[PDB]
């Protein structure tokens, strides 16, 4: 509800494109490449990812496992994507505690 930046934060793609993982050891990078862009996300080697070599990710989709910065999601995928993400992540917590409230609220 305060839209804060998580600590163990996931990295998301800002563009649509295909995934290309390049790792010479001690460093790791995930490339999201398209006809118009080839952007490299260099990640800490310890961090675990969600994308196979050759996957098609859309803009805003997370590349790693953590929580998503709602401001980074705002820029990449727009406001309605942040709304749905916040609701789902909020409703996750109450569901893990057995509390049932409607999504409207």
């Amino acid at each position: 509800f305060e839209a804060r930046r998580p600590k163990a934060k996931a990295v998301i793609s800002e563009i649509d494109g295909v995934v290309r993982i390049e790792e010479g050891e001690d460093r790791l990078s995930v490339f999201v490449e398209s006809e118009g862009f080839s952007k490299e996300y260099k990640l800490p080697k310890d961090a675990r990812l969600l994308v196979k070599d050759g996957d098609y990710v859309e803009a805003g989709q997370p590349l790693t496992r953590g929580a998503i910065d709602p401001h980074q999601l705002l820029e990449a995928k727009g406001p309605e994507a942040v709304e749905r993400y916040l609701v789902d992540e909020i409703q996750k917590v109450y569901r893990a505690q057995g509390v049932k409230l409607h999504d409207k609220h």
Binding site: E80, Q91, R95, K100, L101, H102, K104
Partner: protein
Amino acid sequence: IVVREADCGTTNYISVPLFQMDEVTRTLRLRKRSDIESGLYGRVLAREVEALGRRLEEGRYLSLEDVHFLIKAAEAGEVREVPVRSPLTCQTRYGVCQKCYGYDL
């Protein structure tokens, strides 16, 4: 935020999923029947839905029976999302309207 109008005159909506995706867990399972209730009970469909030899008109307040029916049509393989009028897409300024908001729970 107060219910100010009977209808704000919008065609927008949100698609509430009926299936979840977990990485390492291939394919998409049904969402828990309670979570779907929290996402569908009382809400207004924005587009007409046809499934299991039956049709749900547009603008119908979804009773819990309709939610159970929509879950049956889901596990039959006939519906995967439900178009719904939600406050996220409501055009009522400084409030919501009677149809973008659903039941008085």
